[PDB]
Amino acid sequence: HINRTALNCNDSLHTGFLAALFYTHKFNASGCPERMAHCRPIDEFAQGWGPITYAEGHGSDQRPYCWHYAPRQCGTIPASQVCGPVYCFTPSPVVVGTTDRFGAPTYTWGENETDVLILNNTRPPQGNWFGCTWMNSTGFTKTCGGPPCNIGGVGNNTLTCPTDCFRKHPEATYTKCGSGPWLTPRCLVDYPYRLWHYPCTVNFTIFKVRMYVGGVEHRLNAACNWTRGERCDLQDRDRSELSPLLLSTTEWQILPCSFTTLPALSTGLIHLHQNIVDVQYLYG
């Protein structure tokens, strides 16, 4: 509620989404099994086999809540299509306010033609941020991001990973293929309004992780899907490259049912525990 945050929006469908901006209200959960009916798993897709290049603009008007959504290069966007704060985030959630035509600060409550947002994005460390996410006037999530990757593959099931999908291309990785929040095909980043833009990612458990990108510090409150009894055989573990948090004397904090990329504490390979999914042993 600052005088540098655009608030132009029409609840034209009378769905009452704007209320959650002011006072929290529970989201009707019975609609999710239909809303996420086309968020296919990473397992059922094609397999990349060749050189990997920064992909081209993928315009298919897909749904922006699934993890495998392929955003597009963007930039300046008129200030009359954004309601609520815009979260365009470096690996740690950060917020960019409204600016003037040429970047100078503006304090007009976003109710003016001159005010505009700038979202010229490039990968870190030398860039600024990976991707953006906001909700436009009438209440639909919108996203941006740097070009996804062209995994290739054979058949019409090409993937074009917007995130760090170790499977289907061992060389794909977040720092080189990331687009938006999804650190892996399972886990989001957590910011105050995450429950607003992404409606019912509300049962995700929260983990403490810290990551290194170009020799810089980062603390992330990743909020990552789960449920007990889910098969997590060794062929169901995605590379969430990161700096562990030293959870205990001889254990590390890892995203659920996954693994990080580091040599053991001493004379050891990666040693993952069979039942406690989110622990990787230092030395074993």
Partner: antibody
Framework: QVQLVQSGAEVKKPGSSVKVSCTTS????????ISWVRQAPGQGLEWVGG????????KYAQKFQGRVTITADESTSTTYMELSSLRPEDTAVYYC????????????????????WGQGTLVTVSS | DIVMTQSPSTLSASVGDRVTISCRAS??????LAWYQQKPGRAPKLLIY???SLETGVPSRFSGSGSGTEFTLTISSLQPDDFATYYC?????????FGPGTKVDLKR
């Protein structure tokens, strides 16, 4: 698609108190702020009171302070309004409709009574 | 306080005519206003807000206007579904207010 359903028709005697409720159903969210209105027969409508969707602290018209209380529960998405000291002229049909924030801007954002409305419940305050 | 009044108390016209209704307040209100159409014996509906903007699903024929104290809900052409009473309403953060109500009927 949201449907609002009120209580049934009621009859009471002057001096008593009457309690009326209505529940929302089939909405993307769970709890909606509900605001009530009243019209004496053959007269223009009049706004009784309701739950503010900005702070949830119920607000009444200046001529119902104390006389009317507004309470609601989050379990069933139901809202309650009870009266006190019914005079004979309160006979009317009572409507409950959502107080939904539609327009927003200018350092503040204004709410409105939005379609649809409850079917209507009739109270006949006579002895 | 705020008192909203309408003039005239009743109006008359025929199908296809152009009619005008006036709602005026005691103290100047910038644009906070809205007109509800109340069919006799049924639940009222919203027509316009901000004194100029249409509501989704409302035929474009309805066209409000005005600002300050005086406002109006002028209809270019009447229709058989237009015969009702329009309660010019004011709103704000705390309270709401309604006017006595205008009626429009056939001319004979």
């Amino acid at each position: 698609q949201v449907q609002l359903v009120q209580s049934g028709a009621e009859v009471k005697k002057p001096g008593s108190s009457v309690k009326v409720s209505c529940t929302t159903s089939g909405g993307t969210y769970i709890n909606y702020a509900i605001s009530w209105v009243r019209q004496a027969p053959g007269q223009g409508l009049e706004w009784v009171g309701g739950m503010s969707p900005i702070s949830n602290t119920p607000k009444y018209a200046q001529k119902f302070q104390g006389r009317v209380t507004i309470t609601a529960d989050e379990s069933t998405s139901t809202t309650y309004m009870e009266l006190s000291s019914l005079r004979p002229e309160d006979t009317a049909v009572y409507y409950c409709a959502r107080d939904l924030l539609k327009y927003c801007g200018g350092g503040n954002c204004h709410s409105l009574l939005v379609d649809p409305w409850g079917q209507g419940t009739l109270v006949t305050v006579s002895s | 306080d705020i008192v909203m009044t309408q003039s005239p108390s009743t109006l008359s016209a025929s199908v296809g005519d152009r009619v005008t209704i006036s709602c005026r307040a005691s103290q100047s209100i910038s644009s906070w206003l809205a007109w509800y159409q109340q069919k006799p014996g049924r639940a009222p509906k919203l027509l316009i807000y901000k004194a100029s903007s249409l509501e989704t699903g409302v035929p474009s024929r309805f066209s409000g206007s005005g600002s300050g104290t005086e406002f109006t809900l002028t209809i270019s052409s009447l229709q058989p579904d237009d015969f009702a009473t329009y309660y010019c309403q004011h709103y704000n953060t705390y309270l709401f207010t309604f006017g006595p109500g205008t009626k429009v009927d056939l001319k004979r």
